[PDB]
């Protein structure tokens, strides 16, 4: 069930309440979710950790 | 690759990639596997084209598993390079979903190709 | 793109409400029921309560007929 | 004057007939059994009845899903060698152990009827077992062979 | 069975016999197998081959 | 809130706020696939005529459905527990379902629900070779067919000539497109009931289950001999 | 009797009448099903001979 | 049409052929002085373009090969110094709308040989497509594989390839789009 | 030798033989329906009606080595039927990769490939080679030169094993020869003026004969050493022998027999020589040679009975006057018939049943009444020949000789 989900979902997978409040009012969605605590995103710094 | 069920022959793959080219000109396709699965989730895909050419084919063969839940037709063509040429980008494209429309100019061509697809299921 | 996201999530809310609302209804069947019989008199007769068993209440709607 | 090879797991059963071999492989229409006709025609001759051991169960399962020349069938060829008697095999693709050495085998178009009879009344007279025990050993063998073929 | 024309090609492999009935017949000289060409509705008066031998000019009583 | 029974015990109609069809439980406490659970002290799983195929035949009205709470049944085409769960519910803990399939991709969840219910025993071999599971079980009381292969009549004829006792039931679900498209359902279903009464299957009824499936039928028959 | 003889012939020969929501079909006989192959599909036989007698080849 | 040279192969007599691309898959080859239809070569699909390759055999004998491409990307090579019979059938790797094939590095129809001993075998073969992709095959090794891979696929100009020509030495290819 | 009749609204479109060496001849045939019908040659009945599991069959062909059977159906399917199980038992094997248009003709290369001409003007090539990776999928597609103002149908396809070609006749009249490897045309002839319904070849493939609705038989030859070393058929000859059409053509060639046999819409058969087609002679058979009669007379009342398909008719001499007829439509197929001397009772009889009718001349008409006998209604009859005014002798289709109105001992023959 995780494998048949698109990669954008796997990006935002932890941040559902921020995601759906930022969709149900027209705001900017999160970019990290549960995947923020990966070591590579730890190595990145700035807006390129969103990248 | 053995585990790429229905694979098209040359004539069917030529008309599949022809309707892919005119859907790309009409901005009616979503190119890429994640965009194809998004259209599968939202139920706005007419049929899915995949490429039996990716070196892990298991990055593909999961959208069959939710094609057979929404009974949307899906087909394999032998070349990801040629699918990317048909979709009209500079990269190889692994999967492509032709999206739904009811005022579309190429609706008859889409319907003819999807009937030829669901004959071989 | 963000008001398209707003309309798309509203559409997905109604899509899920639609599918799991229609999952918990029951629709009246409409199927051509056919019964196979012997030589000609079984076809000429009325199929005499072979599965209706009342010709008033439990004959003409088939979601649950009964055997008293 | 004949035997018939019937399986339920690793437990194989070479059950002999209460009539002649020609009578077994010629008519087959006289059983029509409720219980007594199959009980009279049946004769539990040999029961190479193994246990719930997964090795023996899956070994005979692979030999049942393939040709049936297993060691239990060699045991049946040992325990039925009297005068090169007649045998009733279940599957026609087990031709090797059907006719390998001194056994006139026959499995065609009435052997299925007598297997319908003896498979209808396996548990009532052939073992000293009960219906829930036969279903439990069948589902143990089934889950074993399923997790063997379908990997995990 | 009257023959009013004949022609050979530059190899001697085939030969055109044009008959007075109107037909032409290419015989293959190595094995004497024939092929009939029927267009002329009157007598065949002239035949020729091309240099490679793959075209046959014919002319007769029609002015064609 | 009021549960009434059906023509076949183990099948009920939960009337009330939603007059909808339902079966019992043999799974204590839990659903298997997110079907709705109704308690009336006693647990009940909603059947769906769209998610499953036998429920559509029940909703269209099958009088002598030979799937019945005192039998054992052979299911040739489930691929997953979404129908054989309800068949194990209606057959109860007295009997046994043999859910036999070939494609081992949803056989994982087939075996997974067969872990939870001892009623359900799986077979992971193709149903045109019943001899490969000769040595597993025989003499069923009703076969069910849900195979969408072209040789439906031959596959269930072989399975009923090897494993179905006399005067038992045959229920076959026929998809028209898997046999012949472009010709209508009436001709292809007449052709298949004649093809099945070529064997020793006296046809009893067919119905077309039209609000639930496009161009399907369910044919019941009794196995003669 | 001249204007309805084919009517009473077909209405006595044909089967599978309606009964309300239902339809009571006759099953056929092993006699006919084992003495003869089934009838031709007149659709495809008419398609083939209508093709071979199309107007574009001037028959006469 | 394209104009090319052909040898009789029983005499050492050459003559020009014109080659016409027709409707179904047809290439109609006919004499350039008498206009007689010599032979025809049919490929399976939508014929889109074709080119002429030559290869020398001995002193004063060469062989003419017609190279014709489907729209889909599959290429036929016909030996036509004999009867117009296929000797090789391969497939372009990638490429779905194929507009123009060309050879180069030897004598093409646009770098023609003035003297029969100056006929050369072409080294390069470029198959240019509707997306602007030009596959480039090196025929010093890509006459054997039957699914040959290109030495490079150029992608620099993004719309339909309508000209691609090789310089006579065979060191420049010229992609061009109308 | 024998005749196997079918009944009302039955036709037969293709039929193929099968003789595995050491086993009996087997005869399969398609009609206009969804089944294949295999006949046992003894009784003259179908011993098997295998319903093929996809659509209405348009063509049938038999594998080389004759263990498999292709049926090409109206919904674009090519279905393989496993034949080698013994005479009578037929299994489904594999539905090959589908398509849109109906496949109108089939051929096999060997045990390996299967070629099929379809009604969209194309010629597909499938691989029926079991235990390959590409088993069942269609390897190639070829397209013939379409007609300008109507659709094109490829009607006849054969494989030519001496070369490696496929010959194909389509509905423009053109006949094309295709190299099998490279799947592509070698040469096209514009031979006929209308469709080419059937074409065949000899043993060593030096000739290809072809025929269709424009009623000429064309011969394409490759017999010259230069033709064989250049792979160049020539349009050798052309004969006009048939009256209306040619719907079937076949060839036999042995040490003391080399003839091609052809027949069409006009009901007669035509025999020509294979290697001497244009030169040699030909024989147009009579349209009927009544080895099984349909007419007999009785000298009393000067009357004559005659039965066509499922109706009998009786007239008397005088001029002549049609006195009675029996269009029995409870019947479906007819066979042989006999009248009593004195002209009292007629008995009609087919291989499924027989029926006996009392007759009474009421003047310028007759009165005919069934007289019931369920032994006659259950028995299969070939011949009935009237020992007495009451006693008849009955030859059954399963080799029984009864005497009714009971059993002749009949010795056995060395097999």
From Swiss-Prot, chain B:
Lineage: superkingdom: Eukaryota
Family annotation (InterPro entries): eL8/uL1-like, H/ACA_rnp_Nhp2-like, Ribosomal_eL30-like_sf, Ribosomal_eL8-like_CS, Ribosomal_eL8/eL30/eS12/Gad45, Ribosomal_eL8/Nhp2
CDD domains: SNU13 (cd21104)
Keyword Membrane: no
SUPFAM superfamilies: L30e-like
Keywords, sorted A to Z: mRNA processing, mRNA splicing, Nucleus, Ribonucleoprotein, Ribosome biogenesis, RNA-binding, rRNA processing, Spliceosome
One Gene Ontology term of the molecular function aspect: U3 snoRNA binding
Pfam families: Ribosomal_L7Ae (PF01248)
Subcellular location(s) of the protein: Nucleus, Nucleolus
GO biological process: box C/D sno(s)RNA 3'-end processing; maturation of SSU-rRNA; maturation of SSU-rRNA from tricistronic rRNA transcript (SSU-rRNA, 5.8S rRNA, LSU-rRNA); mRNA splicing, via spliceosome; snoRNA guided rRNA 2'-O-methylation; spliceosomal complex assembly
Main subcellular location of this protein, as a coarse class: nucleus
GO cellular component terms, semicolon-separated: box C/D methylation guide snoRNP complex; nucleolus; nucleoplasm; nucleus; precatalytic spliceosome; small-subunit processome; spliceosomal complex; U4 snRNP
Known outcome of mutating residue 80 to A: Impairs binding to U4 snRNA, but not U3 snoRNA, and causes pre rRNA processing defects and an accumulation of unspliced U3 snoRNA
Family of this protein: Belongs to the eukaryotic ribosomal protein eL8 family.
PANTHER family per record: RIBOSOMAL PROTEIN L7AE FAMILY MEMBER
Designated name of the protein: 13 kDa ribonucleoprotein-associated protein
Taxonomic placement: Eukaryota, Fungi, Dikarya, Ascomycota, Saccharomycotina
Swiss-Prot record, chain D:
Subcellular location: Nucleus, Nucleolus
Self-association and partners: Interacts with SIK1/NOP56 and NOP1. Interacts with the trimethylguanosine synthase TGS1. Component of the ribosomal small subunit (SSU) processome composed of at least 40 protein subunits and snoRNA U3.
Miscellaneous comment text of the record: Present with 34700 molecules/cell in log phase SD medium.
Function of the protein: Required for pre-18S rRNA processing. May bind microtubules.
Family, similarity comment: Belongs to the NOP5/NOP56 family.
Name of the protein in question: Nucleolar protein 58
Annotated source species: Saccharomyces cerevisiae (strain ATCC 204508 / S288c) (Baker's yeast)
Curated annotation (Swiss-Prot), chain E:
WD repeats, residue ranges: 39-64
Subcellular location per the Swiss-Prot or TrEMBL entry: Nucleus, Nucleolus
Purpose of the protein: Involved in nucleolar processing of pre-18S ribosomal RNA. Required for optimal pre-ribosomal RNA transcription by RNA polymerase I together with a subset of U3 proteins required for transcription (t-UTPs).
Subunit details: Interacts with snoRNA U3. Interacts with MPP10. Component of the ribosomal small subunit (SSU) processome composed of at least 40 protein subunits and snoRNA U3. In the absence of snoRNA3, forms a complex with other t-UTPs. This complex can associate with pre-18S ribosomal RNAs.
Miscellaneous section: Present with 6560 molecules/cell in log phase SD medium.
Protein's name according to its UniProt entry: NET1-associated nuclear protein 1
Organism, scientific name: Saccharomyces cerevisiae (strain ATCC 204508 / S288c) (Baker's yeast)
UniProtKB/Swiss-Prot annotation, chain H:
Any Gene Ontology CC annotation: nucleoplasm
Repeat (WD) residue spans along the chain: 106-147
Location, primary (coarse class): nucleus
GO BP: any one term: endonucleolytic cleavage in 5'-ETS of tricistronic rRNA transcript (SSU-rRNA, 5.8S rRNA, LSU-rRNA)
Keywords (A to Z) from UniProt: Nucleus, Phosphoprotein, Repeat, Ribonucleoprotein, Ribosome biogenesis, rRNA processing, WD repeat
Superkingdom of source: Eukaryota
Subcellular location(s) of the protein: Nucleus, Nucleolus
Self-association and partners: Interacts with snoRNA U3. Interacts with MPP10, UTP21 and UTP25. Component of the ribosomal small subunit (SSU) processome composed of at least 40 protein subunits and snoRNA U3.
Further remark: Present with 9570 molecules/cell in log phase SD medium.
Family designation: Belongs to the WD repeat UTP18 family.
Function as written in the Swiss-Prot or TrEMBL entry: Involved in nucleolar processing of pre-18S ribosomal RNA and ribosome assembly.
Protein name: U3 small nucleolar RNA-associated protein 18
Full-protein positions shown: 358 to 535 of 594
């Amino acid at each position: 069930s995780l494998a048949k989900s698109p990669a954008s979902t796997i990006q935002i997978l932890g941040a559902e309440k921020a995601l759906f409040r930022a969709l149900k009012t027209k705001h900017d969605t999160p970019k990290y979710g549960l995947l923020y605590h990966a070591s590579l995103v730890g190595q990145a710094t700035g807006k390129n950790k969103g990248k | 690759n053995p585990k790429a069920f229905p694979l098209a022959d040359a004539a069917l793959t030529q008309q599949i990639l022809d309707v892919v080219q005119q859907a790309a000109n009409l901005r009616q396709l979503k190119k890429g596997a994640n965009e194809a699965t998004k259209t599968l989730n939202r139920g706005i895909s007419e049929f899915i084209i995949m490429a039996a050419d990716c070196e892990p084919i298991e990055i593909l063969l999961h959208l069959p598993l939710l094609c057979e839940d929404k009974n949307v037709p899906y087909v394999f063509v032998p070349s990801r390079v040629a699918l990317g040429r048909a979709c009209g980008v500079s990269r190889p494209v692994i999967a492509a979903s032709i999206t739904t429309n009811d005022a579309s100019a190429i609706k008859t061509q889409i319907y003819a190709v999807k009937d030829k697809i669901e004959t071989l299921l | 793109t963000q008001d398209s996201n707003y309309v798309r999530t509203l559409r997905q809310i109604e899509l899920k409400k639609l599918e799991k609302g229609a999952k918990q209804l029951m629709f009246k069947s409409s199927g051509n029921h056919t019964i196979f019989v012997d030589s000609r008199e079984k076809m000429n007769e009325f199929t005499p309560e072979k599965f209706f068993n009342t010709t008033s209440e439990m004959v003409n709607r088939s979601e649950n007929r009964l055997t008293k | 004057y004949v035997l018939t090879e019937t399986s339920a797991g690793y437990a194989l059963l070479k059950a002999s007939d209460k009539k002649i071999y020609k009578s077994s492989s010629l008519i087959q229409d006289l059983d029509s059994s409720d219980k007594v006709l199959k009980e009279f025609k049946i004769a539990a001759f040999s029961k190479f009845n193994s246990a719930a051991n997964a090795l023996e169960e899956a070994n005979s399962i692979i030999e049942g899903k393939v040709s049936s020349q297993l060691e239990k069938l060699l045991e049946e060829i040992k325990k039925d060698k009297k005068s090169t008697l007649i045998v009733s095999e279940t599957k026609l693709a087990n031709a090797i152990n059907k006719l390998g050495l001194n056994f006139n085998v026959v499995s065609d178009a009435v052997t299925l009827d007598i297997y319908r009879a003896i498979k209808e009344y396996l548990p009532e007279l052939l073992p000293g077992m009960s219906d829930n025990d036969l279903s439990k050993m069948s589902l143990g063998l089934a889950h074993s062979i399923g997790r063997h073929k379908l990997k995990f | 069975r009257y023959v009013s024309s004949m022609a050979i090609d530059n190899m001697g492999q085939q030969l055109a016999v044009g008959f007075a009935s109107g037909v032409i017949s290419i015989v293959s000289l190595a094995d004497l197998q024939i092929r009939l060409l029927k267009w002329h509705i009157d007598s065949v008066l002239s035949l020729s081959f091309s240099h490679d031998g793959s075209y046959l000019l014919s002319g007769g009583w029609e002015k064609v | 809130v009021v549960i009434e029974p059906h023509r076949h015990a183990g099948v009920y109609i939960a009337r009330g706020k939603e007059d909808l069809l339902v079966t019992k439980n043999m799974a204590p406490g839990e659903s298997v696939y997110g079907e709705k659970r109704i308690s009336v002290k006693v647990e009940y799983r909603v059947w769906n005529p769209f998610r499953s195929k036998l429920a559509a035949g029940i909703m269209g009205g099958l009088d002598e459905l030979f799937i019945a709470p005192g039998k054992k049944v052979l299911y040739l085409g489930a691929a997953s527990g979404t129908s054989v769960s309800h068949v194990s519910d209606v057959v109860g803990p007295e009997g046994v379902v043999y859910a036999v399939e070939f494609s081992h991709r949803p056989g994982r969840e087939l075996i997974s629900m067969a872990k939870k219910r001892p009623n359900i025993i799986p077979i992971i071999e193709d149903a045109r070779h019943p001899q490969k599971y000769r040595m597993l079980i025989g003499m069923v009381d009703c076969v069910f067919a849900d195979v969408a292969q072209p040789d439906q009549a031959r596959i269930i004829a072989l399975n009923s000539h090897m494993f179905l006792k006399d005067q038992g039931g045959v229920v076959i679900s026929i998809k028209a497109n898997c046999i012949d498209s472009t010709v209508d359902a009436e001709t292809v279903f007449a052709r298949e009931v004649q093809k099945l009464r070529e064997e020793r299957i006296k046809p009893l009824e067919q119905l077309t289950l039209e609000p639930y499936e496009r161009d399907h039928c369910i044919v019941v028959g009794r196995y003669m001999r | 009797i001249k204007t309805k003889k084919r009517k009473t012939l077909k209405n006595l020969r044909k089967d599978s009448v309606k009964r309300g929501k239902f339809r009571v079909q006759l099953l056929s006989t092993t006699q006919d099903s084992k003495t003869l192959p089934p009838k031709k599909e007149s659709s495809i036989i008419r398609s083939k001979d209508r093709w071979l007698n199309r107007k574009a080849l001037n028959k006469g | 049409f394209k104009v090319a040279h052909l040898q009789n192969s029983q005499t050492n007599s050459v003559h020009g052929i014109v080659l016409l691309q027709g409707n179904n898959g047809w290439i109609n080859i006919l004499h350039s002085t008498s206009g007689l239809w010599l032979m025809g070569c049919k490929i399976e699909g939508v014929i889109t373009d074709f080119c002429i390759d030559y290869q020398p055999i001995s002193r004063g004998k060469f062989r003419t090969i017609l190279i014709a491409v489907n729209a889909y990307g599959e290429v036929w090579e016909f030996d036509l110094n004999k009867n117009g019979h296929v000797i090789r059938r391969w497939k372009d790797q990638g490429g779905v709308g194929i507009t123009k094939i060309q050879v180069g590095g030897g004598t093409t129809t646009t770098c023609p040989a003035l003297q029969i001993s100056k006929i050369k075998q072409n080294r390069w073969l470029a198959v240019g497509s509707e997306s602007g992709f030009v596959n480039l095959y090196d025929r010093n090794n890509a006459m054997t594989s039957s699914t040959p891979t290109p030495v490079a696929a150029l992608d620099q100009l993004t719309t339909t390839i309508s000209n691609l020509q090789f310089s006579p030495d065979g060191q420049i290819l010229c992609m061009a789009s109308r | 030798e024998m005749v196997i009749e079918g009944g009302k609204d039955r036709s037969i479109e293709g039929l193929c033989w099968s003789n595995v060496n050491g086993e009996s001849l087997r005869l399969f045939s398609i009609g206009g329906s969804t089944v294949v019908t295999e006949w046992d040659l003894a009784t003259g009945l179908p011993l098997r009606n295998y319903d093929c599991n996809s659509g209405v069959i348009w063509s049938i062909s038999i594998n080389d080595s004759q263990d498999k059977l292709s049926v090409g159906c109206d919904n674009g399917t090519v279905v393989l039927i496993d034949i080698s199980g013994g005479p009578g038992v037929l299994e489904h094997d594999t539905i090959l990769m589908r398509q849109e248009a109906r496949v109108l003709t089939l051929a096999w290369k060997k045990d390996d490939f299967v070629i099929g001409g379809c009604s969209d003007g194309r010629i597909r090539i499938w691989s029926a080679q079991k235990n390959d990776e590409n088993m069942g999928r269609l390897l190639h597609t070829m397209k013939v030169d379409k007609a300008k103002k109507e659709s094109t149908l490829v009607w006849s396809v054969i494989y030519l094993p001496r070369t490696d070609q496929i010959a194909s006749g389509d509905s423009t009249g053109s006949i094309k020869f295709w190299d099998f490897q490279f799947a592509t045309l070698n040469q096209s002839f514009k031979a006929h003026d209308a469709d080419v319904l059937c074409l065949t070849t000899d043993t060593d493939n030096n000739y290809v004969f072809s025929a269709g609705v424009d009623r000429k038989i064309f011969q394409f030859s490759q017999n010259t050493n230069k033709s064989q070393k250049n792979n160049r058929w020539v349009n050798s000859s052309n004969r006009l022998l048939h009256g209306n059409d040619i719907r079937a053509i076949c060839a036999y060639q042995s040490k003391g027999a080399d003839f091609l046999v052809s027949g069409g819409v006009e009901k007669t058969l035509v025999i020509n020589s294979l290697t001497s087609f244009s030169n040699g002679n030909y024989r147009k058979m009579p349209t009927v040679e009544p080895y099984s009669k349909n007419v007999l007379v009785n000298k009393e009342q000067r009357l004559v009975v005659s039965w066509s398909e499922s109706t009998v008719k009786i007239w008397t001499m005088g001029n002549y006057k049609l006195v009675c007829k029996l269009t029995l439509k409870d019947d479906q197929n007819i066979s042989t018939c006999s009248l009593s001397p004195d002209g009292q009772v007629l008995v009609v009889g087919r291989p499924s049943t027989t029926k006996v009718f009392h007759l009474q001349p009421v003047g310028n008409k007759l009165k005919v009444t069934k007289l019931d006998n369920d032994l006659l209604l259950r028995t299969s009859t070939k011949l009935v020949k009237f020992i007495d005014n009451s006693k008849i002798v009955i030859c059954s289709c399963e080799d029984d000789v009864f005497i009714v109105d009971q059993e002749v001992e009949l010795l056995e023959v060395t097999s």
